[PDB]
Design a protein around this motif. Structure first.
Motif, PDB file in Angstrom:
ATOM      1  N   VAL A  94     -46.421  -9.624  -9.514  1.00 24.09           N
ATOM      2  CA  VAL A  94     -46.813  -8.909  -8.306  1.00 24.09           C
ATOM      3  C   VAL A  94     -48.129  -8.185  -8.537  1.00 24.09           C
ATOM      4  O   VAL A  94     -48.459  -7.782  -9.655  1.00 24.09           O
ATOM      5  CB  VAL A  94     -45.718  -7.923  -7.854  1.00 24.09           C
ATOM      6  CG1 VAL A  94     -44.448  -8.667  -7.499  1.00 24.09           C
ATOM      7  CG2 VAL A  94     -45.467  -6.889  -8.933  1.00 24.09           C
ATOM      8  N   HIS A  99     -40.915 -11.337  -7.399  1.00 28.40           N
ATOM      9  CA  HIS A  99     -41.621 -10.977  -6.175  1.00 28.40           C
ATOM     10  C   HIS A  99     -41.125  -9.641  -5.645  1.00 28.40           C
ATOM     11  O   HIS A  99     -40.120  -9.099  -6.099  1.00 28.40           O
ATOM     12  CB  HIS A  99     -41.446 -12.053  -5.098  1.00 28.40           C
ATOM     13  CG  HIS A  99     -42.178 -13.326  -5.385  1.00 28.40           C
ATOM     14  ND1 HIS A  99     -41.779 -14.211  -6.365  1.00 28.40           N
ATOM     15  CD2 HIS A  99     -43.284 -13.865  -4.818  1.00 28.40           C
ATOM     16  CE1 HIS A  99     -42.606 -15.240  -6.390  1.00 28.40           C
ATOM     17  NE2 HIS A  99     -43.531 -15.053  -5.464  1.00 28.40           N
ATOM     18  N   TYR A 100     -41.849  -9.115  -4.659  1.00 21.66           N
ATOM     19  CA  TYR A 100     -41.416  -7.927  -3.941  1.00 21.66           C
ATOM     20  C   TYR A 100     -40.282  -8.251  -2.971  1.00 21.66           C
ATOM     21  O   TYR A 100     -40.147  -9.379  -2.483  1.00 21.66           O
ATOM     22  CB  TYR A 100     -42.574  -7.313  -3.157  1.00 21.66           C
ATOM     23  CG  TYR A 100     -43.566  -6.578  -4.015  1.00 21.66           C
ATOM     24  CD1 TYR A 100     -43.158  -5.538  -4.833  1.00 21.66           C
ATOM     25  CD2 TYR A 100     -44.920  -6.905  -3.988  1.00 21.66           C
ATOM     26  CE1 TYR A 100     -44.069  -4.848  -5.624  1.00 21.66           C
ATOM     27  CE2 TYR A 100     -45.839  -6.227  -4.766  1.00 21.66           C
ATOM     28  CZ  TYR A 100     -45.407  -5.196  -5.585  1.00 21.66           C
ATOM     29  OH  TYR A 100     -46.313  -4.511  -6.359  1.00 21.66           O
ATOM     30  N   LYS A 131     -43.795 -13.853   0.303  1.00 17.66           N
ATOM     31  CA  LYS A 131     -44.525 -14.218  -0.896  1.00 17.66           C
ATOM     32  C   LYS A 131     -45.877 -13.531  -0.969  1.00 17.66           C
ATOM     33  O   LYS A 131     -46.709 -13.910  -1.796  1.00 17.66           O
ATOM     34  CB  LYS A 131     -44.669 -15.737  -0.976  1.00 17.66           C
ATOM     35  CG  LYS A 131     -43.313 -16.417  -1.185  1.00 17.66           C
ATOM     36  CD  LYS A 131     -43.380 -17.927  -1.237  1.00 17.66           C
ATOM     37  CE  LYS A 131     -43.802 -18.429  -2.587  1.00 17.66           C
ATOM     38  NZ  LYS A 131     -44.384 -19.795  -2.436  1.00 17.66           N
ATOM     39  N   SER A 170     -46.369 -15.969 -11.754  1.00 21.62           N
ATOM     40  CA  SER A 170     -45.525 -15.243 -10.796  1.00 21.62           C
ATOM     41  C   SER A 170     -45.453 -13.775 -11.238  1.00 21.62           C
ATOM     42  O   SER A 170     -44.576 -13.392 -12.012  1.00 21.62           O
ATOM     43  CB  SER A 170     -44.143 -15.864 -10.705  1.00 21.62           C
ATOM     44  OG  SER A 170     -43.579 -15.700  -9.419  1.00 21.62           O
ATOM     45  N   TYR A 204     -37.797 -13.532  -2.595  1.00 21.96           N
ATOM     46  CA  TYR A 204     -37.866 -14.934  -3.067  1.00 21.96           C
ATOM     47  C   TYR A 204     -37.256 -14.984  -4.467  1.00 21.96           C
ATOM     48  O   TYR A 204     -36.406 -15.830  -4.698  1.00 21.96           O
ATOM     49  CB  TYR A 204     -39.325 -15.388  -3.142  1.00 21.96           C
ATOM     50  CG  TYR A 204     -39.570 -16.740  -3.767  1.00 21.96           C
ATOM     51  CD1 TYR A 204     -39.713 -16.887  -5.136  1.00 21.96           C
ATOM     52  CD2 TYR A 204     -39.673 -17.877  -2.989  1.00 21.96           C
ATOM     53  CE1 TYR A 204     -39.917 -18.123  -5.722  1.00 21.96           C
ATOM     54  CE2 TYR A 204     -39.895 -19.119  -3.556  1.00 21.96           C
ATOM     55  CZ  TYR A 204     -40.011 -19.244  -4.927  1.00 21.96           C
ATOM     56  OH  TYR A 204     -40.224 -20.460  -5.501  1.00 21.96           O
ATOM     57  N   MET A 264     -49.222 -11.027  -4.289  1.00 22.26           N
ATOM     58  CA  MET A 264     -49.116 -11.506  -5.659  1.00 22.26           C
ATOM     59  C   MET A 264     -50.502 -11.505  -6.299  1.00 22.26           C
ATOM     60  O   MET A 264     -51.504 -11.228  -5.637  1.00 22.26           O
ATOM     61  CB  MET A 264     -48.479 -12.903  -5.677  1.00 22.26           C
ATOM     62  CG  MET A 264     -47.063 -12.946  -5.069  1.00 22.26           C
ATOM     63  SD  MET A 264     -45.903 -11.787  -5.888  1.00 22.26           S
ATOM     64  CE  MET A 264     -45.578 -12.720  -7.390  1.00 22.26           C
TER      65      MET A 264
END
Ligand SMILES: Cc1cc2nc3c(=O)[nH]c(=O)nc-3n(C[C@H](O)[C@H](O)[C@H](O)COP(=O)(O)O)c2cc1C
Ligand SMILES: Cc1cc2nc3c(=O)[nH]c(=O)nc-3n(C[C@H](O)[C@H](O)[C@H](O)COP(=O)(O)O)c2cc1C
Lengths: 406, 406
Positions: A147, A171-172, A134, A145, A167, A137
């Motif tokens: 990045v 996300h990455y 996580k 949410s 996740y 961010m």
């Protein structure tokens, strides 16, 4: 004489006893304002300031923002005050403005805050962590949410987890930690502990919750490893137990060690079929930690999987805490957090009255040891005083605030 | 992007608009959350943090205590935040731990606080003063009324007033200021103004209340002089008018100048026969100040004579403010302070409803311009948010505190 507080490099009036201390302790004093011993320390009440990320750091360094935020609450007498999640490595930050402790200079900025805390006779701890998959961010007020791109300070190519499983699509996608990465994380953990001791913190809390690195390792929905770190309950908690052993080897035996756990993934419902981390796992883990030098189980939950199904409301995580408490008994202290909105509810949770969320007013009861509050303090830094008045408890407050009301 | 706040030497997130700003301003917005223009400035609401001595300074210097106290309130969006009474001379301090501004280094410590205030987009002022015959006392929590002896940091041989008349048997007996002392006070006033501008304050307030030096000169019960500074209403206010002229010569015309007055000695009752300062005098003084560059009349009262007979209670000084307001009209702004315990009362005082103390709920009405609060903020630094919710006004709060509640 306007006596100075000892042991700090600036003059300020001594607060004896410290703010938040019940002035006439007796058997009728609510448990919430009763002292609590933990190893060498004595909290003067059972209200803890929960760790709260501020997303206001400068390359991991605290600034005057943190002094105004923490210092304003600490001067109003939480039994213990916990500093926000602090990354032991740059790539472990939740955002580019997260607190960090990979540099000695970050420790020197933290020290300013603990010197203020100690000038008030108050106790202060730090939550150490690593955001795992996580990480990188943007601050949540910019977007729930999204990045942080490389040009916005992000670090996509360094985001790491126990398995190469994102996740979410927002996300990455992490790299799966090699054994070398795991060792580098353990080394960085040790180096941040030494900086934490040198800044003078009174307690250390291990962050094993909210879908960050250590929570990712314990949960089978995020940890698919086939080495010594995956494939069974014992392997999936191995990294957590190695972090506890490293910590207890480095910090004084006199110093309390806390651990914050996500009691459950909230995937324990029908319709979701994958295996997940449950409150029974957290209880079994609690039992093991109780014999390895962990003094308090901070009980939170969730934030490890986007399909979680959370039943929120007043005291909604206290039932988890009470179930963990039932298995560790007096071997470990248990604290509860999450929508504890009143001194009455808080007093009920600690004393075992009002049901498992303490909201009931009728009618046995699992007692808890500590109440933890985040948003309550942001709305009112003087929450301890407000709850003391709500419960009829005369308490000490800072000299600067008191004489105006006599 | 987690945009930085401009113009300060540390990184912190921009608060745009600043905390305490009504998000949907319209004709139905309560006056309390309506903006207020004062010379070049625009307060985003009409709630001012009242000046509050902390008795925590080190040879007049601010410390981390002041950052935690002021910074915690300022980040929660008072329309204007006022720093405590700050002596322009060492012997002008109320106690050995009072704030001071006779040294450049004291200004540099103040600057840290205004840089934090400005990093939040908030406005900050300083109250300059001199305690006169009430100087060299001990912090009030040590004793309501006791002198600081020479070995406890006191300065008995330097305590000064307009006349050699002690306030009480519990205070020191002052020397009557010579013309040379009066000139030295005027010079020190000018030197402290330059330090205040250099630290970056947005407004200056002249302290003419609470039995300190300037209040002592205006009241005939404390000023028995026979020179140009006594013996008539015009002579007794001469020092105040000379301080206003010096100030307006030195600070920018763009900068608001406030003056805090004790509307009355509270000796205007039968049984006490000596002549005293009354609300009619304060109103006549207000009329004169309105034409000499004073933008706001902060209305307090009392503390100049131990035989005062105060009728306290919710909004007990607001009637004085409304009477002063009736004589200056739109030539000057008037602010009220003292046991304003609710957003409803506050909104009533500003809009002219609820009677002269705004506590009534029935039924014309003298409107006021600004509400000032001290003890309310000490109990709850988040008072602005609490009053906004009480009145149904959606307001901006700091990004760090907001996203947790959405
Ligand atoms: C702004 C904010 C920051 C937080 N930061 C952290 C954190 O750094 N570490 C942590 O373990 N929990 C963090 N939390 C979760 C809270 O500590 C707390 O457990 C949760 O908000 C529920 O408690 P509450 O209902 O008293 O707010 C944060 C919550 C908020 C609102
Ligand atoms: C601890 C404390 C310190 C104060 N310091 C000052 C001061 O430095 N200058 C001032 O003009 N008034 C000072 N006051 C008076 C307050 O500013 C305010 O006018 C008074 O407390 C009534 O307002 P309240 O009812 O909102 O508290 C102080 C009051 C308190 C309780």
């Amino acid at each position: 004489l306007n006596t100075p507080a000892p042991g700090v490099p600036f003059y300020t009036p001594l607060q004896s006893p410290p703010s938040g201390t019940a002035l006439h302790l007796s058997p009728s004093t609510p448990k919430l304002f009763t002292p609590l011993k933990i190893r060498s320390l004595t909290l003067q009440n059972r209200i803890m300031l929960s760790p709260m990320c501020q997303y206001s750091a400068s390359n991991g360094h605290f600034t005057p923002w943190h002094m105004a935020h923490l210092g304003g609450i600490i001067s109003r007498g939480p039994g213990l005050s916990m500093v926000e999640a602090t990354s032991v490595l740059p790539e472990g930050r939740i955002t580019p403005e997260d607190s960090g402790l990979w540099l000695d200079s970050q420790g020197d900025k933290l020290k300013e805050v603990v010197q203020f805390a100690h000038s008030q006779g108050q106790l202060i701890g730090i939550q150490l962590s690593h955001a795992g998959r996580k990480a990188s961010m943007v601050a949540p007020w910019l977007d729930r949410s999204a990045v942080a791109t490389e040009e916005a300070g992000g670090w996509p190519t360094k985001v790491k987890g126990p398995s190469a499983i994102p996740y979410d699509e927002h996300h990455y996608k992490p790299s799966a930690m090699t054994l070398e990465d795991i060792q580098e994380f353990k080394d960085a953990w040790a180096a941040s502990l030494k900086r934490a001791l040198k800044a003078g913190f009174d307690v250390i809390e291990i962050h094993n919750a909210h879908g960050y690195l250590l929570h990712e390792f314990v949960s089978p929905v995020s940890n698919k490893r086939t080495d010594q770190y995956g494939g069974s309950f014992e392997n999936r908690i191995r990294l957590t137990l190695e972090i506890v052993e490293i910590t207890r080897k480095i910090i004084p035996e006199s110093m309390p060690l806390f651990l914050r756990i996500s009691a459950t993934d909230w995937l324990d419902y029908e319709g979701f079929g994958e295996e997940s981390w449950t409150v029974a796992d957290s209880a079994r883990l609690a039992g093991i930690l109780a014999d390895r030098g962990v003094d308090l189980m901070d009980v939170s939950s969730g934030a490890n999987h986007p399909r979680q199904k959370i039943t929120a409301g007043l005291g909604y995580q206290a039932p988890f805490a009470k179930e963990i408490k039932r298995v560790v008994g007096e071997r470990m202290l248990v604290g509860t957090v999450g929508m504890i909105g009143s001194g009455r509810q808080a007093e009920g949770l600690l004393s075992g009255m009002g049901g498992e969320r303490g909201v009931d007013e009728g009618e046995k009861g699992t007692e808890l040891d500590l109440v933890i509050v985040a948003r309550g303090f942001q709305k009112n830094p003087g929450l301890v005083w407000e709850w003391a008045e709500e419960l009829g408890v005369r308490i000490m407050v800072a000299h600067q605030m008191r004489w105006g009301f006599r």
